[PDB]
Amino acid sequence: NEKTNRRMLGWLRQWTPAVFKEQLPLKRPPKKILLLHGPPGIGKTSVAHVIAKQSGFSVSEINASDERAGPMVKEKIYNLLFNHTFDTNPVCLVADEIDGSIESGFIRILVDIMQSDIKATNKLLYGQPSKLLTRPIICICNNLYAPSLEKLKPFCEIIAVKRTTLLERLNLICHKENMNIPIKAINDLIDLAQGDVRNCINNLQFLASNISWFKIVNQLFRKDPHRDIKEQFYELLNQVELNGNSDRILQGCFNIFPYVKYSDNGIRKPANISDWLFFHDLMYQSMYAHNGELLRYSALVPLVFFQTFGDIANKDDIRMKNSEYEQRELKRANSDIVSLIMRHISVQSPLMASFTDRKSLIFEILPYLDSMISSDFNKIRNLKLKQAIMEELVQLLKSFQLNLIQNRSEGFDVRGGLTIDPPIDEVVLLNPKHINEVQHKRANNLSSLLAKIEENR
Amino acid sequence: AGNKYNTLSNNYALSAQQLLNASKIDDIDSMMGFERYVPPQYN
Amino acid sequence: ERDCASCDFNRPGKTCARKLKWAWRGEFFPSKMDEYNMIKRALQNETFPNKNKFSKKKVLTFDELSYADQVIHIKKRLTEYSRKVYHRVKVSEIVEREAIVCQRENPFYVDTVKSFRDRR
DNA sequence: TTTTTAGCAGCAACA
DNA sequence: TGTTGCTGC
Ligand code: SF4
């Protein structure tokens, strides 16, 4: 990334007139913050440190993910930006992992400092007869499009670090320790350390004295044509066993297998794997009932995916997600809504509660109740029949204890949508096309039903 | 490429709602003596 | 001058181009185009409430606002800036301008006025 | 969502 | 003392 490293150095040299009073209203860069983004382990932090030191700045690093007290940190950042350090050298602030700050405190403080400096500069330019930012700020993220950074981006100079720099650093350490290491062995050490700089330096020191579950899932669908299938199988078995998280690996395999290319005859391969997956579910249920002796067999089920679906065609890494946690939380929320409706029926309908099972309520009663509420009353020309149906629907809303709430969360005084509480809609409406049609019809019906409920009150 | 069928249904529904309002207006107009006169054919 | 130059009735000796004066009046901010651009760049670093209702995204950037809303926010900060730097919010100026009234152009507007005047 | 224009008096605040 | 707002000409 030499071009990127020269751009960073060029941006830090634009601070030189303001900080060092050297000749290349304060001639500062238009963008006062440098924002570095890119993959982990490529040296973002190391490049920020080296270029800041090379430019004559003292480097102060803050991890933004660990500092869960922006309002307090505030004092640290204000001292580091505006107070003279005892060091002869001006401070450069390096903020690492700024995308990890779940609490916008750190970013709000930086935005407040930038806005205060813009107000102070405009007063110096236009003010007829306020702490100015005299120090550079470097911020490092993994993700540029993180919601927290949206307010900071306009003040930032954005620099992408793409995927050598570790090899150059390790060579410089070898040369300073008088170690004659062949460049091949340093590459093999980098590959062993997976780009961990700390692990690399420790392994080098030891020489001188003398698998993410996702990566395993993608490896389970890959066959190398140049290695024995048995050696690959034992290597994968050892990696699955060392990880101890066989369940997450299998859930990964389950989400990936439909998208994987596998020579297909009749999609039987999937039928054989449903029986294993069922075997895993029985084994996982038995782990809570019996002392975990059965845990040794849990590593075998992921390896059936390597045997059945492993192909040379699968060269690209498929990214994955956790639909199950979202489905479990949604199933919990829907079960809680249904449990609340069942309690409401028990309090009002003395007999209905005896005939209503949870399943019959979800599949039979609630879909019909919603179809009755969503029915187009605008097609009914007979006012008497419209009034009678509306009186029966008000009686049904009362039997199920369904409250019409005016959600006034619109915010702009136009059409506060009426919503049913509890929201039966989230339990019954499975089809996204039907959701939009039903919402438009319901809005006119619910206003008529609310007016009738108010008339009855 | 995923909504071309849901716009046609709403326009037929709106045209049917407008015809139903026009029928109610024809009923009210006739109550108030405004029967819909159609003139004789003249060639 | 363009549409008059494109017209085949535009000869040497033309009588049909009646020139008449009018007094234009601007009210403008004392602030210049560099100061306007400085206020625009300052507003691009601010965040704005979505006039959205049953909608969701509660917050917009400046460039995600409608151009009319962008100019409403610009005019607000320019009123404060102009008052702070120039001690006035507005300048007003009157400029005498000239325009060409075609006499050969299709008479439908003026015929409506003449005819309406005569019927009255 | 429908929608003529500019010039002026004068009370009251604030630049 | 002047400008600026608002209502109502
Ligand atoms: S009719 Fe008007 S536009 Fe045409 S030549 Fe004459 S002045 Fe020009």
From the list A81, A45, A79, the residue with the least C-alpha distance to A63 is: A45
Q: Is A96 helix (H, G, I), strand (E, B) or coil?
A: strand
The DSSP 8-state label assigned to residue A84 in this structure reads P
Cα–Cα distance between A18 and A54 in angstroms, integer? Answer: 17
From the list A423, A419, A421, the residue with the least C-alpha distance to A407 is: A419
Within 8 A of A416 by CB-CB distance, chain C residues are 53
Q: At what angle do helices A383-399 and A366-373 cross, to 10 degrees?
A: 140
Q: Are A354 and A262 in contact (CB under 8 A)?
A: no
From the list A205, A110, A202, A197, the residue with the least C-alpha distance to A152 is: A110
Query: Is some CB atom of chain A closer than 8 A to the CB atom of C67?
Result: no
DSSP string of C21-32, one letter each residue? EEEEEEEE-S--
Cα–Cα distance between A104 and A64 in angstroms, integer? Answer: 10
Q: Which atom of ligand 1 is nearest to the CA of C10?
A: 5
Q: Is A419 helix (H, G, I), strand (E, B) or coil?
A: strand
Ligand 1 center from residue C99 Cα (angstroms): 12
Cα–Cα distance between A264 and C63 in angstroms, integer? Answer: 50
What residues does ligand 1 touch, defined as CB less than 6 Å away?
C 3-4, 7, 9-10, 14, 16-17, 102, 104
Q: At what angle do helices A300-309 and A229-243 cross, to 10 degrees?
A: 140
Q: Is C94 helix (H, G, I), strand (E, B) or coil?
A: strand
Cα–Cα distance between A164 and A245 in angstroms, integer? Answer: 33
Both tokens of residue A5?
């490293």
Cα–Cα distance between A13 and A56 in angstroms, integer? Answer: 10
The DSSP 8-state label assigned to residue A290 in this structure reads S
Query: Is some CB atom of chain A closer than 8 A to the CB atom of C37?
Result: no
Cα–Cα distance between A60 and C51 in angstroms, integer? Answer: 42
Whether residue A417 and residue C44 make contact (CB cut-off 8 A), yes or no, is: no
Cα–Cα distance between A214 and A234 in angstroms, integer? Answer: 18
Q: Are C17 and C102 in contact (CB under 8 A)?
A: yes
Within 8 A of B24 by CB-CB distance, chain A residues are 381
Distances (CA, A) of A89 to A21, A49, A133: 13, 14, 16
For residue A381, give the nearest of B6, B9, B20 by CB distance. Answer: B20
A41 is an annotated ligand-binding site residue: yes
Nearest residue (by CA) to ligand 1, atom 2, is C102
Distances (CA, A) of A85 to A7, A55, A80, A335: 27, 17, 8, 59
Cα–Cα distance between A195 and A44 in angstroms, integer? Answer: 12
Q: Which atom of ligand 1 is nearest to the CA of C105?
A: 1
Both tokens of residue A416?
């506060």
Q: Are A131 and A143 in contact (CB under 8 A)?
A: no
Cα–Cα distance between C14 and A444 in angstroms, integer? Answer: 66
Q: Is A146 helix (H, G, I), strand (E, B) or coil?
A: coil
Cα–Cα distance between A167 and A183 in angstroms, integer? Answer: 8
Cα–Cα distance between A189 and A43 in angstroms, integer? Answer: 16
Give the closest-approach CA distance of A73 to chain C in angstroms.
23
Whether residue B17 and residue A378 make contact (CB cut-off 8 A), yes or no, is: yes
Both tokens of residue A353?
């509660």
Cα–Cα distance between A99 and A37 in angstroms, integer? Answer: 10
Ligand 1 center from residue C113 Cα (angstroms): 22
Query: Is some CB atom of chain B closer than 8 A to the CB atom of A285?
Result: no
Place of tokens 């192909």: A311
DSSP string of A235-287, one letter each residue? HHHHHHHHH--HHHHHHHHHHHTTTS----SSS-HHHHHHHHHHHHHHHHHHH
Nearest residue (by CA) to ligand 1, atom 8, is C4
In Å, how far from its chain's centre is CA A19?
Answer: 39
Q: Which atom of ligand 1 is nearest to the CA of C5?
A: 8
Q: Are A155 and A114 in contact (CB under 8 A)?
A: yes
Q: Are A130 and A5 in contact (CB under 8 A)?
A: no
Query: Is some CB atom of chain C closer than 8 A to the CB atom of A126?
Result: yes
Radius of gyration of chain A (CA): 32
Q: Are C14 and C25 in contact (CB under 8 A)?
A: no
- Listed as ranges, the nucleotides of chain E within 7 A of a protein C-beta are 3-5
Helices (H), A14-104: 16-19, 44-54, 70-82
Query: Is some CB atom of chain B closer than 8 A to the CB atom of A437?
Result: yes
Cα–Cα distance between A33 and A156 in angstroms, integer? Answer: 5
Residue A5 has φ and ψ, to the nearest 5°, of: -65, -40
Q: How crowded is the C-beta side of A396, counted as CA atoms within 13 Å?
A: 16
Enumerate neighbours of C (3 or more CB pairs within 8 A): A
Q: Are A250 and A299 in contact (CB under 8 A)?
A: no
Q: Are C3 and C99 in contact (CB under 8 A)?
A: no
Task: Let me know the angle formed at the C-alpha of A151 by A146 and A155, rounded to the nearest 5 degrees.
Answer: 110
Count of residues in chain A: 457
Q: Is A137 helix (H, G, I), strand (E, B) or coil?
A: strand
From the list A305, A292, A178, A194, the residue with the least C-alpha distance to A254 is: A305
Task: Let me know the angle formed at the C-alpha of A70 by A67 and A71, rounded to the nearest 5 degrees.
Answer: 140
From the list A398, A382, A407, A406, the residue with the least C-alpha distance to A456 is: A398
Whether residue C54 and residue A410 make contact (CB cut-off 8 A), yes or no, is: yes
A44 is an annotated ligand-binding site residue: yes
User: Straight-line distance from CA A411 to C1' E6, in Å?
Assistant: 29
Helices (H), A296-382: 300-309, 323-347, 352-355, 358-360, 366-373
Q: Which residues contact A188 (CB under 8 A, 6 or more apart)?
A: none
Residue A155 has φ and ψ, to the nearest 5°, of: -90, -10
Torsion region of A429: left, alpha or beta (phi above 0 gives left; psi -120 to 50 gives alpha): beta
Number of CB atoms found within 10 A of residue C98's CB: 8
Torsion sign (Cα): A322, A327, A330, A335: negative
Whether residue A378 and residue B24 make contact (CB cut-off 8 A), yes or no, is: no
Bridge-based pairing state of the strands A91-96 and A137-141: parallel
Q: Are A227 and A260 in contact (CB under 8 A)?
A: no
User: Straight-line distance from CA B14 to C1' D11, in Å?
Assistant: 54
Cα–Cα distance between A400 and A420 in angstroms, integer? Answer: 11
From the list C41, C42, C60, the residue with the least C-alpha distance to C50 is: C60
Whether residue B6 and residue A436 make contact (CB cut-off 8 A), yes or no, is: yes
In a 10 Å sphere around its CB, with 0-12 CB exposed, 13-18 middle and 19+ buried, how is residue A209 labelled? exposed
Q: Is C97 helix (H, G, I), strand (E, B) or coil?
A: strand
Question: Quick one: CA torsion of B21, B24, B26, B28, rounded to 10 degrees?
Answer: -140
Both tokens of residue A230?
């048995």
DSSP string of A148-201, one letter each residue? GGTTTGGGEEEEE----HHHHHHHHHHHHTT----HHHHHHHHHHHTT-HHHHH
